[PDB]
Amino acid sequence: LHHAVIPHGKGGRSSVSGIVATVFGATGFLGRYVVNHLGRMGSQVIVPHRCEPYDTMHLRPMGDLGQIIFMDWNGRDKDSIRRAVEHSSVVINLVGREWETQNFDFEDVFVKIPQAIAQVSKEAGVEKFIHISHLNADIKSSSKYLRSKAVGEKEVRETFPEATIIKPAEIFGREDRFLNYFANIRWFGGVPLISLGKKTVKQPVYIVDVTKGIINAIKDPDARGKTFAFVGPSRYLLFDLVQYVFAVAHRPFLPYFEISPFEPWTTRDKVERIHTTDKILPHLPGLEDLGVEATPLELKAIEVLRRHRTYDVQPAKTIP
Amino acid sequence: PSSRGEYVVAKLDDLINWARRSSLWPMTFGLACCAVEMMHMAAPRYDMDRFGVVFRASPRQSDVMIVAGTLTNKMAPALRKVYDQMPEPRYVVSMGSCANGGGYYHYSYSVVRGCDRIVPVDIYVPGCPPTAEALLYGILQLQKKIKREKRLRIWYRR
Amino acid sequence: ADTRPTVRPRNDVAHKQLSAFGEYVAEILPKYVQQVQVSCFNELEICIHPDGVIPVLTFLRDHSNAQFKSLADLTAVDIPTRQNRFEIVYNLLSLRFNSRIRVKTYTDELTPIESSVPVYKAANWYEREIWDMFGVFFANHPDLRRILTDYGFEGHPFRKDFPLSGYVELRYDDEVKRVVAEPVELAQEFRKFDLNSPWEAFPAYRQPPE
Amino acid sequence: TYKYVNLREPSMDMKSVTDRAAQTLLWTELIRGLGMTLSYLFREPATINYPFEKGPLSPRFRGEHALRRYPSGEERCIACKLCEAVCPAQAITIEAEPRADGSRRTTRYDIDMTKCIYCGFCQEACPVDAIVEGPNFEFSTETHEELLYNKEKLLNNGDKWEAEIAANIQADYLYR
Amino acid sequence: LVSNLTLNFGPQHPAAHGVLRLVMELSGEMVRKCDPHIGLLHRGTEKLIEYKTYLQALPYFDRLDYVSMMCNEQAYSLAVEKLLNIRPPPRAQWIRVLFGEITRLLNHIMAVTTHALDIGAMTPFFWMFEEREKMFEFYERVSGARMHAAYVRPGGVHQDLPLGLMDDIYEFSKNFSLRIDELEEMLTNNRIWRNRTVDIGIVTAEDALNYGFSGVMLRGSGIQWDLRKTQPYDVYDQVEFDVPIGSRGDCYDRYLCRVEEMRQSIRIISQCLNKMPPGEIKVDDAKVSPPKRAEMKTSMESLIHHFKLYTEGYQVPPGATYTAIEAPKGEFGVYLVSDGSSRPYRCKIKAPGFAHLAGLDKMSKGHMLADVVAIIGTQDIVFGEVDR
Amino acid sequence: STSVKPIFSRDMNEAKRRVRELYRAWYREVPNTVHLFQLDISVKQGRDKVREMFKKNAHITDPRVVDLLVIKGKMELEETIKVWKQRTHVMRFFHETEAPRPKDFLSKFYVGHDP
Amino acid sequence: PLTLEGIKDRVLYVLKLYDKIDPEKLSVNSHFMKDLGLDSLDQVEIIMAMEDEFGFEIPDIDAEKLMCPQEIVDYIADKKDVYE
Ligand SMILES: NC(=O)C1=CN([C@@H]2O[C@H](COP(=O)(O)OP(=O)(O)OC[C@H]3O[C@@H](n4cnc5c(N)ncnc54)[C@H](OP(=O)(O)O)[C@@H]3O)[C@@H](O)[C@H]2O)C=CC1
Ligand code: SF4
Ligand code: SF4
Ligand code: SF4
């Protein structure tokens, strides 16, 4: 080690942990939680952000004085990546869009950028590289989102062989776009667009468990070079899941929106993914192997959906 | 005429920025002494209203929160409550040593060591208390910070 | 009154009058008064057994030669070396006679003290402050509850053994969307200074050797 | 010696009763209050045109901190730590050692400007006029880290503001 | 208990007194129970003072009643001086009365104008803070700080008055009675103002004393009591002024008392300017007061005393005193205990606002909700001293 | 001596009575608190916490120490019932942000010098 | 209306719900503290169940005595004045 990066303190805010992480995509749903947990234990977080500085203000309270540092970067400019990972020990990558835009398509957010971040990380001496993928990633899947996730996951495993590739399922939480999707898009102005909802089986994982899993992959030395699958305790039927969501939100459920500029809310590919069936890949290690217990949907679903609820609830039925 | 999309976005961005900085309605937590200097910034000599900054703004029409005094542990939940109710865009101005980092009660058991532990802060105004003129300099620094925002220009390149 | 520009003059007539009244109070309430002393700067203190509060405070308020109608203050001092670590101090004011008097008693962590609210309604909040900061319980108090510390605050900060910065500190956590308490960790520890000089400053206050 | 602020007895003659009746019905005092506000509308405003005009200060004003030098250019600070000992807020942190030429000079001088109460005890306690509070009161920052001054910052402030600081000391050192 | 309205001034308005959480039970428009909750500006000041020398603790007293900065300092200095058994020189006693009365004017302008501002009369607030702004310049010229002067210290004052200050104070005092008169042209005889203050929050003389009230809160009810007249402490025995006394014990008499105190303060300030004597400003005793910077750089003894005074501090003989002054808000007193070292063992602060606020429930009984705003204002509550 | 003024109980039997009563008031309250404060815990987790707090003070045998423990517990209840607390104070009992702290020698040995 | 055997039906119904109590060891006379092995704290939880079930308050003095279901049924009867 180096005398600076030796852990000190009691793991709190003003303590030292020796983790010096660059988190790309720190301003997203998954990024805000990772930065939060890295900053509870006194890590040095470099936050490369493309957005306005205003959009990052929520991250500033998450660290002590000096612990969170912000940088500009452009996925196309490699030298902006290098300035971001030059002094780092772990480089976490959470870059993605649920939708394409004019400038970045799914093959640029998921293949060309992650490969560039991984290559510069190798050439800059970085030791640990966390790359996020999807559980349902498949070269033969119709959803273009997942096919890009498959190729990009293939290039990371060649550029940075010692990289930890994490494959979660649909992640649910307060700011998720999974249960918030079933509560809003299905309800307001519409009746569910479920396409044969009885044929889809879903295994969703809580955000904090994914956040915990990512951290322990940094602190666990056997995680290097290993691909993981983070899945919830239970498998649900997509039809029942939507039904259960509605009961929590006290919105009546009756079985049976164009993409646009701004931020497509509901899209062609999103439906193709909400219907893809959560692959079971037993040989891949999961949260069990990182010291995290997957948390039930039922506990952490009233938390997510209490806002939609306007102004005595029965759980869903699991699929063995 | 002829104009690019980049040019249109740059000019619209200047319009909304000019409006947002020209009409800053501040909410003020007058927690302690520093509230007295905030009141002097409203009095005749400096007259913050002449910049377009209204003397009194409700929490749910406010554009900027000015934290003027010591934030104790008993008070911290209420300040975060007010902050969440504020509609965006929202900015926090930390006024004086107490709010900046605890100041002269920094080593107290009942005091938050800086309001940046509770809410994100955009400008820090030093002093114990900062002079009314020193606070006015801080607000004018927030106007320049807003002038440099590029929300639309970023949105175009997304 | 002497031509010593920098030395506070002595008022000896005030010292004599306050000593006469100290005996008067001791003669009238011998059951309770444990000590009477008048300082050099003319301030009478009556020390009493904790059970004489109400009789002693009532006599000073209502007697035609006391008439200490006003409770100027009420506070506790913590002296951990004493067996009764807490000393309760009553500062009273007489407007008829333009005089002040101090009444002191003592207690421990597990001995209640009679509430003086029956005598001075001013003592209601003073005793809530004493309970909150010192953890001294007052019996028969109309409404005893914390007055200064945060809700759910464990401990009594003004005890000499309570650490200056306490044990818990508050921050806002994004994950749980609320203000969370956590064990205190300071980026810069409070630096303790040893300032006492090793040479005696005031012989008049020298204590006899062990 | 005391006076009665409100112990008048209103006169009960008809002339006085009619005066109060006229006041009650014709709103006389209320019109008088409107007169005073009208007079202020035609008085000149006390506002000054900040930042082009500034409020008056004095030489004794306590502002941003700076470390000074002797005319030769050597630092005045000898690392006696009298400022660190006196600082009511414990805002000052000092370390020292013998310099390469054997001089008694600091290697760390820090002021946590967010701890400081701008009381000026440190300049009162300094024996060599090394630490001063300058005339600058316009140095608000966007981040908390920008308000934790190390030795370089305070030396740079002394180099930046020496011209004014020296004149202010010249004006007030006899009072001190 | 028709309804309990938990009124938090958390989203504070332009008052700056602090923040008060008020829990009330409103049986209609009327108020049946009032319960102030006052922990929001509790900063642990009394405990922090135990870790500071006597000099280091003085700035804490600026930040209690932060509209009576130099009056809070004087109370601390009078307490410490009494334990030290020293005397400040005659010139400093006049400077401390002079700035004690400039501070009384500062406090009453805030008290009356923010009281009126809460009851809708916004304009006098701006009229008078142009005057407070000119008073803040006197503070800055003698101390270098507009508010927390740290100027009145045990033994006297830190520095002497700069040349030309007394003329500027006289010029301010010459035009100031007219400023008060304009304020009374807008409030004294105004029927709307009287309807909002007359026979509101009445306090009887007997209940005032038992509840611990002091200052205007007593004199409004007709009690002839002023510490400056009955227990004088600096040169107040050498200045003529009258004490305003109320007759009905309501808000309106308390409003009149404060406005008359501003006039008597200008009367006193006039005498201080004429009677200011020459001499030194701090006790000429270097084991308490620091020596002049010229002597410290020339004399061995002065350098030693300078070195020790700003490190260890002067030791105070063991003892305990209760010292009180007539602060603008009321009787401000400190119970200070010395263990013989250079750091106080215990410093209990007696804030007049602590008792007054505790007496709010008594005063609010049988009044409408909009009156409570008027009752709190007439008490002149600042939560720096309520909580400490 | 052992002659000491009592707070309320004059022997442990009376003290254990007030302890028992105070547990009734807390046991009834948790269902209300979990609703008024909109907590994310189940009423079972809440009632276990009340059991945990009462259990930690089991060894106590001094009648006076028990009176004060009850006095403090009632003040805590009065704050929660009257809703003087806030959602943040009620949830401080659960320490949901503090990370797991080990208790076995090897675990404490790896991280730091704390005993 | 009263049904002394009705009382015993509900009491056993309530105790059957309490998660700690194993149904098998339960008897009309099984001791809470010894046979069942509950703690004093748990005995207070059970009594509170009966107050809800039988719509009245069981005082603390009485609550300590009701140390087994048979005692509960007897005590319930007396306050309801069931003479069966
Ligand atoms: N949450 C889920 O359901 C699942 C998520 N994942 C993976 O998790 C990761 C993050 O999840 P989430 O946080 O929900 O994704 P978000 O969309 O919430 O945030 C993604 C981040 O990527 C950044 N970003 C997007 N496009 C670009 C770009 N072209 N150039 C630079 N930065 C860019 C955004 O920054 P800005 O906002 O500044 O554009 C944003 O901070 C993604 O990689 C996703 O594939 C995988 C499986 C399931
Ligand atoms: S920073 Fe200074 S003036 Fe402001 S509240 Fe704190 S002590 Fe008072
Ligand atoms: S001005 Fe006062 S608080 Fe600030 S560094 Fe100097 S001595 Fe310390
Ligand atoms: S700045 Fe002055 S007082 Fe402080 S260490 Fe240097 S020489 Fe000593």
Side-chain angles (χ1 to χ4, degrees), chain A residues 4-302:
Chain A
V5 302
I6 286 175
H8 294 298
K10 293 181 78 70
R13 190 171 168 89
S14 302
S15 312
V16 189
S17 74
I19 297 165
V20 184
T22 305
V23 186
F24 292 94
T27 51
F29 174 41
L30 191 50
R32 77 193 297 111
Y33 283 82
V34 169
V35 176
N36 182 20
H37 274 207
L38 281 170
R40 292 180 181 177
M41 54 182 166
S43 312
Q44 176 64 240
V45 184
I46 297 89
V47 172
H49 63 89
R50 168 268 302 274
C51 56
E52 267 289 305
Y54 177 94
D55 286 334
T56 70
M57 295 297 294
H58 66 279
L59 301 174
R60 290 178 186 276
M62 294 176 176
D64 200 4
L65 295 185
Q67 291 293 16
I68 314 299
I69 291 166
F70 293 92
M71 288 184 184
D72 295 328
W73 68 277
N74 181 250
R76 306 215 155 86
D77 182 6
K78 290 168 93 71
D79 285 12
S80 78
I81 298 171
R82 193 166 294 98
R83 291 192 293 276
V85 309
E86 214 171 343
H87 310 281
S88 301
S89 77
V90 58
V91 166
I92 309 180
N93 173 248
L94 313 173
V95 164
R97 292 291 86 192
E98 270 195 1
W99 58 87
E100 287 205 359
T101 69
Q102 299 186 320
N103 291 116
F104 306 93
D105 59 353
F106 284 141
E107 197 183 79
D108 291 9
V109 289
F110 287 131
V111 184
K112 287 181 70 61
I113 280 176
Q115 191 281 332
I117 290 167
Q119 193 194 296
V120 179
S121 296
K122 181 62 66 68
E123 296 175 13
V126 168
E127 173 183 333
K128 296 175 185 289
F129 191 97
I130 314 304
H131 175 68
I132 304 305
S133 184
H134 208 305
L135 180 74
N136 304 359
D138 181 17
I139 53 153
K140 298 182 291 300
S141 180
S142 54
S143 169
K144 185 158 56 164
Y145 182 78
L146 292 172
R147 279 188 280 95
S148 297
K149 282 289 207 178
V151 178
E153 166 170 347
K154 196 149 183 279
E155 295 188 7
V156 172
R157 183 59 67 187
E158 298 168 328
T159 297
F160 206 101
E162 315 86 357
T164 302
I165 296 176
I166 293 170
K167 292 157 60 64
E170 275 70 31
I171 315 178
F172 71 96
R174 272 210 191 83
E175 301 104 326
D176 68 335
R177 297 170 91 78
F178 173 74
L179 304 184
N180 294 6
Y181 175 87
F182 298 142
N184 268 332
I185 309 302
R186 258 44 176 173
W187 177 78
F188 85 84
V191 176
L193 305 172
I194 295 165
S195 173
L196 189 71
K198 287 70 170 183
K199 255 60 168 183
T200 300
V201 185
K202 279 282 168 219
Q203 207 166 8
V205 67
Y206 192 47
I207 188 67
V208 178
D209 304 338
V210 181
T211 301
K212 286 170 171 172
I214 293 159
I215 298 295
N216 300 331
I218 307 168
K219 298 175 167 179
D220 183 69
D222 303 353
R224 286 218 308 159
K226 286 187 176 181
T227 309
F228 287 83
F230 294 177
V231 297
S234 302
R235 294 180 63 82
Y236 292 99
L237 198 68
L238 177 56
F239 168 89
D240 297 307
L241 207 64
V242 177
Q243 186 174 226
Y244 180 58
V245 171
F246 270 84
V248 171
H250 287 260
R251 302 292 205 184
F253 168 74
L254 319 174
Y256 263 122
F257 302 96
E258 297 80 352
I259 70 182
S260 67
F262 294 165
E263 293 82 3
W265 60 272
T266 312
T267 60
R268 200 170 312 290
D269 184 297
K270 172 59 165 287
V271 176
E272 205 63 19
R273 285 199 294 97
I274 284 282
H275 284 96
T276 303
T277 297
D278 284 5
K279 305 171 187 288
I280 301 166
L281 307 163
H283 64 261
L284 292 174
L287 285 168
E288 62 282 348
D289 313 283
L290 293 166
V292 185
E293 295 180 357
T295 302
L297 168 72
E298 281 63 27
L299 276 165
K300 304 286 194 174
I302 313 306

Side-chain angles (χ1 to χ4, degrees), chain C residues 110 144 146 150 152 156 179, chain F residues 64 68 72 75 79 88-89:
Chain C
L110 305 179
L144 207 71
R146 73 174 72 269
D150 188 9
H156 306 270
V179 171
Chain F
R64 296 182 298 167
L68 282 175
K72 292 176 169 208
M75 291 180 181
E79 293 171 359
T88 181
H89 305 76

Side-chain angles (χ1 to χ4, degrees), chain E residues 302-334:
Chain E
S302 295
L303 185 65
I304 286 169
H305 289 49
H306 175 91
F307 190 103
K308 299 294 292 183
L309 281 179
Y310 281 106
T311 50
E312 172 175 354
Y314 50 83
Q315 308 96 352
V316 183
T321 187
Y322 180 78
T323 288
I325 62 162
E326 178 59 34
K329 285 179 168 37
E331 171 173 317
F332 179 84
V334 59

Side-chain angles (χ1 to χ4, degrees), chain B residues 29 31 65 71-85 110 112 117-119, chain C residues 150-151 170-172 177-181, chain E residues 8 10 21 39-40, chain F residues 84-90 92:
Chain B
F29 290 100
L31 299 164
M65 184 188 301
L71 186 62
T72 65
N73 292 315
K74 204 173 194 171
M75 185 63 186
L79 188 153
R80 184 73 198 195
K81 193 203 305 199
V82 169
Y83 174 78
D84 292 330
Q85 291 169 9
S110 53
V112 186
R117 289 172 183 268
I118 309 302
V119 296
Chain C
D150 188 9
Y151 308 108
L170 302 192
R171 70 178 182 85
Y172 172 83
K177 303 290 191 307
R178 65 167 176 279
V179 171
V180 301
Chain E
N8 183 7
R21 177 179 175 166
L40 293 172
Chain F
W84 290 343
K85 280 191 198 293
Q86 295 170 77
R87 180 170 176 274
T88 181
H89 305 76
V90 169
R92 275 170 208 174

